[PDB]
Design a protein around this ligand. Structure first.
Ligand SMILES: [Cl-]
Ligand SMILES: [Cl-]
Ligand SMILES: [Cl-]
Lengths: 117, 128, 127, 119
C-alpha cells in the first residue's frame, strides 16, 4: 500500500536481496526542476521499450509514468529484482497549461520529460 | 485514553518514508536479476544514465560482485526533487562459485548492465 | 559485504527528524506540569498562540483532563516549514480523584494555560 | 549530532502521550513555521511561558539560526509531572543564503515571531 509498508517489508533484507515488489514501488527515482519556461522531469527507468512507456497529465495536475516489460530467463534463477510493471504518480508543483506541446526523450535508460508552464 | 508515543512514532516514520532521498537510491540501485545457464552466471542490473567510462565491475576474493558508478548531474533553476543517485556502490554475494581466472564479459545498453561470468565446474584455480 | 536494508531505513528516517511534522506536534503539545497544592490539582500547559475562546477544558468520567484547542494559520508567502499545530486534543490521567461538584478555574496568559481542579482527599489514619 | 533526534524520540517509546519526559520537550520545543515574504524571512515559533529577556537568538557561522531560552519553574505542593522544558536550544537550518544582518523579534502570547532579511 503505502511506502512505509513497502519499505518495512524489506526490513530484514541484505542490500542485494530486495524484493521485485519493492523496486516496483521505488523505481523510478525522479529529478524535477523548472528551466526555460517549462517543467522538467527526469527518471531513471532502464531497459524498457519506448512503445511500452506511457506518460500522462492528470486533470489533477499529476504526472503519471507507466511502463511494462516481460522478462523470462532460461536456466537456474537466483535473483529476480528488476521490475516488470511501473506506475509512478507525481503531483506537479506548478500548474501546467491545459493546451500545450510536451516533449519527451528516452535515451540510456533515462526518461526526460518537458512540460510548458 | 491518552494515546501512545508508539503510534506517534509510527505515523512519523510513515511521513519520513513518503518521499525518498537520493542517498536512499544510492544504496538500493541497481536491482538485479541473476541466473545461471550453460555454465555461465549472468547478472542483469538496471543502471540508467551512466557513462561506460564511469562504471566499474569488480570480482572480490569473497565471491562477491561489486558494481561501481558515478556521475555528475547539473541543476539549473528551481529544483523540486533530486532523487536520482550520483554515486553507486552495489555489493552482490554470488550464488555459485565463479572462475576469477577466466574471461569475464559485460555490456551496457539501454541503461542495462549485463555481466556474464563463467562458473567453476571443475577444480578452482587462483592465479595470484 | 552487502549493506543492510535496516541501516538504510534508519539513516533515511534519522536525517529527516530535525524537521518534525505538524501532526507530531498536534500529538505532543502541550507539555504539562502537574501538582497538588491547597486541596486542588494544578495543571500548567505551554500552549502558545491560541485564542482564549478557542481553548476548551473538560473532565472525563474516567478521571481524565482533556485540553482541546483550535486555530488556523492564515499566513501567506512561500512556505518552507509547517510545524506549528492547528488542532490540540490532549487527554491527561489525573493522579487524584476530583470532587466532581467543584468549579474548575482556568487562566491563559503568555501562552500558558493554568488549570486548578479541587480534589477529594482525607487525612490517612492507622489505628 | 545526527541521530540525536532519533534517540530523543525513541527514548519515549512505550510511554503514553500523558507522561512524555521534560528532556523530550526540551529537544522538540519549539515547533516553528518558516516562510519568506518580502526581503525578510519570517520564523514563527511556539515558545510559551518564557521571559523575553531570557530568550536569546543568534545567527551562526555555518548559517544555522539558533534560538536560546532558559527559565525556572516553581512548584508548591506534591509534584506529579514536570514536562515543561527549562532550557531551550533550537538550531534551525536556513533555506535561503545568509552576511550578518539586523534581526527583528517580537514575543507575544508565547509566540516568538522573528524576521531575518536575506539578499
Ligand atoms: Cl493510469
Ligand atoms: Cl570497491
Ligand atoms: Cl551555545
Amino acid at each position: 500500500g503505502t511506502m512505509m509498508n513497502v519499505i518495512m517489508r524489506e526490513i530484514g533484507k541484505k542490500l542485494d536481496e530486495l524484493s521485485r515488489e519493492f523496486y516496483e514501488s521505488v523505481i523510478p527515482p525522479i529529478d524535477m526542476y523548472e528551466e526555460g519556461g517549462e517543467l522538467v522531469v527526469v527518471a531513471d527507468l532502464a531497459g524498457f521499450n519506448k512503445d511500452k512507456i506511457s506518460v500522462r497529465l492528470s486533470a489533477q495536475n499529476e504526472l503519471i509514468i507507466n511502463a511494462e516489460r516481460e522478462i523470462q530467463y532460461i536456466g537456474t534463477k537466483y535473483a529476480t529484482q528488476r521490475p516488470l510493471k511501473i506506475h509512478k504518480v507525481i503531483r506537479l508543483p506548478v500548474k501546467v497549461k491545459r493546451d500545450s506541446q510536451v516533449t519527451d526523450k528516452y535515451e540510456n535508460g533515462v526518461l526526460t520529460i518537458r512540460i510548458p508552464v
